[PDB]
RNA sequence: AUUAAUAAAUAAAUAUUUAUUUUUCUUUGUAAAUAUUAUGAACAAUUUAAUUAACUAAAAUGUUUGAAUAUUUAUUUUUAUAUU
């Protein structure tokens, strides 16, 4: 998991499978025994550890000397979701939907694909968001709600896409440890929504000139309309 | 080349001739000549029909 | 206490069955391809190696 | 198997329900039911594909995976390799040497130390 | 490759993504389960009457 | 169960010595293994279904922290039982055969098939005949735990002038009795 | 299961079988008594080993002369077989043969013949006549030498040895024929002999095959994998021919489907038909112009 | 449980004599006819004496006793090499029986010469007296 | 091991305990009383605790619980 | 001509510098290494390992007062089938057991008697029939077999040899 | 793969060469070491050297492993009293050589003794240690440093209670 | 098979029979290095004398 | 193996394909068709006689006494086990 996609990484990469390669592997950098010429024993935890840790640092991971990126920062995670929604649904289509069910088949499929991509991105970013709840900011939480609205996914406060868990029999799902899989996605997202609502309330309580008066007014109006749209109060 | 053979024990490694119980080339020629001469004499024991 | 089915190299290193002349003669329903239309068994193949 | 619990958890078998090498489908039809009866705990995951993987994978209790090729392998060979997957625990790849015959070194009476028998001397 | 060569099994991992697809991947319930394409004979073209129906009074049974 | 013998004194004196952990040297697959109650070994392949409760018949030696029984060559009344954890193939050994003369190369892969077996229990129920003298081949009728069956005496006599003399304590230190 | 020296009791059972073959029926019975005691103590009720040792004990009693004891033991064996689940076909055939022999010894010729016929029908209705030589039918193809070591090209495995159920039923039918001849019946003997002949014919037919390479073949040792496989036997091939035993084809996992079921194909996100994929489209203006209406005509063909 | 047999029948010679009796001991010296050299038996010679055919894994209990057994007493299967070894022992027995039968048949027919050795041995070795008559 | 320790004590009582004799006695006693395996260097503990032996002056001196 | 090109390029990562960088050099070095390791395994490794085991056993014997020579000869004489590897293992991990074996070898304990030859019972020579019953030799053999059955382990069949021998009467039914 | 640096420690380097007694390596273990006293009065020099080497190299321990260099220290005393069988004292040569053309030094055991008897004992111990381990410098060197030599009966190791080393000749 | 301190040079030719298996009468090693390099000389076996 | 050249059974070696159940205690590679065939010794003596290996372990091979020391003849000191 070192050299490939990690915790909050979006790219899906099966390190054992040599995808994204133009050459048939001739040399295996991580080799412990000469027998691995014909019996690599990949998949076994220890040998796989050796191979993956011998792999070089790709774009996702960072070297020990290169300066990493604070991907676990809420102020970065939220705008990532906003950009995902923006790319998924064009500004013209967003304006049309806001003004307005009479839509083209291509536009409907585009909206569905955007919702699916947003759900996948939320699934991938969930652990980082959960870790970054504590030191988030009111503007970024409001941005979280705005990004959900723009993606057109209604959060499960208790169309809708988070409320239904993905299909698949429990006896075949990938339960392997070390992979950030969230089987209880709707419950986790509902808990995150409640936590961010409480955090917004606490931030407003802590906060309690013309510029600041206008900021407070616009913030209150936003909070109100966004929570009403998502089906939340206070 | 030399005909290599699958071994069944180190005795086959030490072995030089594949068939030790077989006469060498010259003895083979001698024995074949004697056998052919004996067969010819047995054929000619009776007169020339 | 059934014996374990432990793979040996004589019965594991085995390829899928390609219909032979007897099978295709017995049940013509299996002669489904030009691949199944194979030559006489006396034909080993194109010669390999040097005499 | 360890303490009555099979180390193997699931076995992935990818195949094409048509227009492909018969071996995998024939194995599914003939041998797979017997394997399922013998090891009901193992979860069989049948994956229909247009371009099948021509391999059988086994995911074990520790999350590791062991894959076997079946490009032109016979159904009997596929069955034997599936049983090999079940048998192996996929934990270690040690050699079969005199040193490695005993996994963990142990002493019931107690190992030898320099001061054991040191003060014992010859007698008559 | 060749069955007897070590290259036939030199690859031991990465062939399958352990996570199954949520579209068509299923499990083997048991012998009562009828699997698509499954057949005891090595049919390289596993067709049936629905795929390529036969124009004849009877299905070509061995009895006939 | 426990040790038995027609002599009640010897039976009751030796039974307490068997209680405790035990080790056994067993013969299997033309190889000899020393095993304990929780030891895992890799024997050559045994046609045994995995998870099978198996027993080892021919045992060369048994012992513990207080006793040791030897077999000449084998023993009886020894119950060494294990569980067949795995049936696998160990690490591959590559034999590459080639000669500078002929352009022929042979690549042999020997993955040594093996069965991994974890010993679950070791028990011993010996049947002793009687006390056996060491320095004489005769076996005693009467067993006396309070007296050494074969007393030992120091070596130094003074006749050997050029004898390597050790420290006096080691040279003549008496030994205790291990049955009282 | 309680511990029992099954190795020693198996030694005793083998010794009893040797005594049976040597005609020392009393000694065979004595050994089978101990073996049956041990098996009864060790194995659970209605077990294959227990019923088998009871069959052997009944045979020993019958041979010694205790016909009533043999009849009682074989009756209990049949009761245990009925109580069990998935009994061995060979074991039940042998039990029926032993019951028939015991009835014949008692003098119940009709009942012995009925038992033999019951065994015959049981084997015919629940026996696979080719499974014995599934892996032994293509052995002749292994042979690569013709001048010498050609016994491998004609290696023969006797069904009497590689299928004990067949031998048991053959013996039972021979005894039934003998009983019919003794009684004077003709139709019964004819039918039983004909059924025996048909059984042997089935076995041979399953054993039959043609000859591959005849003369010497050099090299091509990797052909052994092809030569020894799960080659279907004639009986299996006829039973599960592709047409009688049709292949279930679920179009959910397939692209091409019949004309009437074009909608049951693997679903797509949002797919549109472009054309028939005419390779000449790439060539030029005239080449494309020579195929403008092909897609329309194909659509009309596949309408509805 | 465990097994320890030196003979097929499982019987063994009395190993422990009566109490207070001088125990019997084997012949430590080699079986050489001449009194000299006076050499003690080798480890391989002791193996031969005790029943193993010179090696631990050739004959004796280490070769004839099953290496394992199911906890419930069920014995082990007949390996191909086990059957081959049994056939080899039967072959040794057959060789012995056939040699004895050949000797008996020669004796009955009257072919066993009354002279000790063949002509070559007789004219090579003075130790054979002269049987002229 | 206890018999060996007794013999060592009997040998060393007359001439007084030596450094090596005391070390061997400590090793024997530890082996006798041990129920597990010691995989760490014995001198490591002495190296760590040498601050109890070597005395540091001033307010920088180290004492238990700083 | 076949060379382990694909098989050895895989482990070519285990070399240094030029061999690890250039395919030909690495393949040649790996081929040579494999061949030399094969030769060593098949002609010297066993000798070296068994010499090491011999030396360990000899050192244990020396500490106990004996040596490898006398220890081996006396093990052969006493019929204790412990392979040298087993002797080394016992000496290293079970010093008390090794000392007990050495004491057995040292003691004047009579070594086990040689294996017995099959004995024909007088029942075989006894005539049968004398002029429903069982052959006396067969009965004796059955009794010996039942005794072996009972002595093999603490089975629940019971220790009554006569009761076991009379087992068939249990299944017999009186007419 | 393992890589031994070309920049080694050289006798001409100020850093100097080490003493394996004070070194700390994965293959050095002085915890199980013992101390023996070998009085070489009237004992043949080759026999004394062999006996001392057996303990020095650690071959006398049942836990001996060729890779691991563990052995008991041996204090050899009265090396001056060491005996040679016959005229060997002057008829046994010691030969060494320098890189120079002349180079060759042929000397007698008498000269080696007159310079330093401990040097002669060291030579024989080195011969034994090389006979058994010659392929590795560490193996060739460390046991020699384990060995201790003293021509007189006075040694400073009294603080270690070196137990007298008792052995018997092949005869 | 060893250094001169363990195997004298004349002992190298010990596999051959004759006087070479007897210790030479004269040794010219300790003193100096003779120009001809003869290091050992055996007792005259008649008018013949052997040198190494 | 080897005979140039008139009515004489048979060149052998290697390779390819192929052929024959003959009795005697045991054991035994004989034959045919076909392809190819300079890897090269001078004397003396005597003679009807002289680079191969499946893995694990096992494993049996390996400086005195027909003189010396001494005096004007007397002295001196002449099997095993075990390792490829």
PDB file of C-alpha atoms in Angstrom, chain J residues 90-158:
ATOM      1  CA  UNK J  90      19.233 -33.963  22.014  1.00  0.00           C
ATOM      2  CA  UNK J  91      22.645 -32.815  23.249  1.00  0.00           C
ATOM      3  CA  UNK J  92      21.868 -29.145  22.576  1.00  0.00           C
ATOM      4  CA  UNK J  93      18.271 -29.040  23.852  1.00  0.00           C
ATOM      5  CA  UNK J  94      18.007 -32.078  26.185  1.00  0.00           C
ATOM      6  CA  UNK J  95      21.363 -32.360  27.963  1.00  0.00           C
ATOM      7  CA  UNK J  96      19.869 -34.660  30.599  1.00  0.00           C
ATOM      8  CA  UNK J  97      18.561 -37.029  27.923  1.00  0.00           C
ATOM      9  CA  UNK J  98      21.921 -37.021  26.143  1.00  0.00           C
ATOM     10  CA  UNK J  99      23.680 -37.754  29.436  1.00  0.00           C
ATOM     11  CA  UNK J 100      21.229 -40.595  30.062  1.00  0.00           C
ATOM     12  CA  UNK J 101      22.062 -42.057  26.646  1.00  0.00           C
ATOM     13  CA  UNK J 102      25.783 -41.760  27.403  1.00  0.00           C
ATOM     14  CA  UNK J 103      25.230 -43.458  30.769  1.00  0.00           C
ATOM     15  CA  UNK J 104      23.350 -46.281  29.047  1.00  0.00           C
ATOM     16  CA  UNK J 105      26.243 -46.747  26.631  1.00  0.00           C
ATOM     17  CA  UNK J 106      28.811 -46.675  29.453  1.00  0.00           C
ATOM     18  CA  UNK J 107      26.925 -49.101  31.695  1.00  0.00           C
ATOM     19  CA  UNK J 108      27.375 -52.852  31.373  1.00  0.00           C
ATOM     20  CA  UNK J 109      23.678 -53.219  30.517  1.00  0.00           C
ATOM     21  CA  UNK J 110      23.163 -56.191  28.164  1.00  0.00           C
ATOM     22  CA  UNK J 111      22.236 -54.884  24.707  1.00  0.00           C
ATOM     23  CA  UNK J 112      18.910 -56.071  23.315  1.00  0.00           C
ATOM     24  CA  UNK J 113      18.910 -59.651  22.029  1.00  0.00           C
ATOM     25  CA  UNK J 114      18.849 -60.176  18.258  1.00  0.00           C
ATOM     26  CA  UNK J 115      15.468 -60.519  16.531  1.00  0.00           C
ATOM     27  CA  UNK J 116      13.830 -63.926  16.802  1.00  0.00           C
ATOM     28  CA  UNK J 117      13.127 -66.234  13.868  1.00  0.00           C
ATOM     29  CA  UNK J 118       9.580 -67.387  13.184  1.00  0.00           C
ATOM     30  CA  UNK J 119       8.809 -70.501  15.229  1.00  0.00           C
ATOM     31  CA  UNK J 120       6.510 -73.266  13.980  1.00  0.00           C
ATOM     32  CA  UNK J 121       4.142 -74.317  16.799  1.00  0.00           C
ATOM     33  CA  UNK J 122       3.687 -77.979  17.653  1.00  0.00           C
ATOM     34  CA  UNK J 123       0.068 -77.539  16.553  1.00  0.00           C
ATOM     35  CA  UNK J 124       1.238 -77.377  12.932  1.00  0.00           C
ATOM     36  CA  UNK J 125       2.701 -80.877  13.269  1.00  0.00           C
ATOM     37  CA  UNK J 126      -0.377 -82.015  15.193  1.00  0.00           C
ATOM     38  CA  UNK J 127      -2.572 -84.009  12.823  1.00  0.00           C
ATOM     39  CA  UNK J 128      -5.903 -82.530  11.764  1.00  0.00           C
ATOM     40  CA  UNK J 129      -8.443 -84.069  11.510  1.00  0.00           C
ATOM     41  CA  UNK J 130      -7.384 -86.665  14.102  1.00  0.00           C
ATOM     42  CA  UNK J 131      -8.911 -89.545  12.114  1.00  0.00           C
ATOM     43  CA  UNK J 132     -17.098 -78.024  13.220  1.00  0.00           C
ATOM     44  CA  UNK J 133     -13.767 -77.617  15.025  1.00  0.00           C
ATOM     45  CA  UNK J 134     -10.751 -75.397  14.388  1.00  0.00           C
ATOM     46  CA  UNK J 135      -7.139 -76.237  13.656  1.00  0.00           C
ATOM     47  CA  UNK J 136      -5.073 -75.911  16.865  1.00  0.00           C
ATOM     48  CA  UNK J 137      -2.372 -73.950  15.034  1.00  0.00           C
ATOM     49  CA  UNK J 138      -4.992 -71.534  13.710  1.00  0.00           C
ATOM     50  CA  UNK J 139      -6.441 -71.169  17.209  1.00  0.00           C
ATOM     51  CA  UNK J 140      -2.986 -70.398  18.618  1.00  0.00           C
ATOM     52  CA  UNK J 141      -2.394 -67.814  15.888  1.00  0.00           C
ATOM     53  CA  UNK J 142      -5.780 -66.234  16.622  1.00  0.00           C
ATOM     54  CA  UNK J 143      -4.935 -66.083  20.328  1.00  0.00           C
ATOM     55  CA  UNK J 144      -1.625 -64.384  19.537  1.00  0.00           C
ATOM     56  CA  UNK J 145      -3.403 -61.888  17.291  1.00  0.00           C
ATOM     57  CA  UNK J 146      -5.979 -61.102  19.971  1.00  0.00           C
ATOM     58  CA  UNK J 147      -3.193 -60.660  22.523  1.00  0.00           C
ATOM     59  CA  UNK J 148      -1.459 -58.203  20.193  1.00  0.00           C
ATOM     60  CA  UNK J 149      -4.771 -56.387  19.681  1.00  0.00           C
ATOM     61  CA  UNK J 150      -5.268 -56.026  23.429  1.00  0.00           C
ATOM     62  CA  UNK J 151      -1.658 -55.045  24.173  1.00  0.00           C
ATOM     63  CA  UNK J 152      -1.397 -52.421  21.417  1.00  0.00           C
ATOM     64  CA  UNK J 153      -3.330 -49.971  23.585  1.00  0.00           C
ATOM     65  CA  UNK J 154      -5.997 -49.388  26.252  1.00  0.00           C
ATOM     66  CA  UNK J 155      -8.897 -50.305  23.996  1.00  0.00           C
ATOM     67  CA  UNK J 156     -12.366 -50.741  25.449  1.00  0.00           C
ATOM     68  CA  UNK J 157     -12.886 -54.186  23.929  1.00  0.00           C
ATOM     69  CA  UNK J 158     -11.845 -55.621  27.299  1.00  0.00           C
TER      70      UNK J 158
END
